[PDB]
Amino acid sequence: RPIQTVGRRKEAVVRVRLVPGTGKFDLNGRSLEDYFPNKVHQQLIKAPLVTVDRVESFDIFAHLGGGGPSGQAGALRLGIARALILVSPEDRPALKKAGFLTRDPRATERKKYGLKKARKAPQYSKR
Template sequence: MENAQTSSKTTKLKLDFKDSKYATGRRKTSIARVWLKKGSGKIYVNGKLYNEYFASENHKMQITRPFELINQSTGYDVRCNVKGGGPTGQAGAMVHGISKALVLLDESFKSTLRTEKLTTRDSRAVERKKPGRRKARRSFQFSKR
């Protein structure tokens, strides 16, 4: 009985993504490899459904936004491998990758997604810590005496 439960957790989710478009999305220190094809609207992230992978409702809304903008929320299946960074960076990287893959699939989506700035990489990242400072910009407390 116990072996049956553990074996179901260890089996890799096999998805058929032949005839799909591939794109890479990036945000902060996260990288998302995205495969997109016509389907029923399922979104898989690292082998899990995106509802299970992301806890925040904000991130879930963010991921489905490119599909809502092109009025096809259930028209495509997505398989995505994400690594690096935290949930916000990973969600942003997925949005970037999905948008790029949609443009590869159909050029007519480009203007819609571009006006919402989803095809452009968001280059903002954490500023590095400088020597002689407590954080990136914060100084140590000044002592007059």
């Protein structure tokens, strides 16, 4: 039984599948630079891999659903970081201080009546 976990950031929810190997991110089939074409997203994907010191190994491929291209990228970070706990339960405090285990509970604040955004008020005009 290989190890699979789940990560979710904004409303994007991902399902990472962990396979040992050579480091080939075949996300939804196609590769990492195919639909994550921004270098700043590509840092935060493999950002937990430089703390476990296996940036080369673990050729993973995952499922990407919901959200948008930074929520989908940010959800994949937690899914890696959860996966490197089940496959090695001895680098817990390496990734605890890195802040990659925390789900970062930040969603969109709802829009309110009278206001025109979550907190934007319309004009005041005292006469």
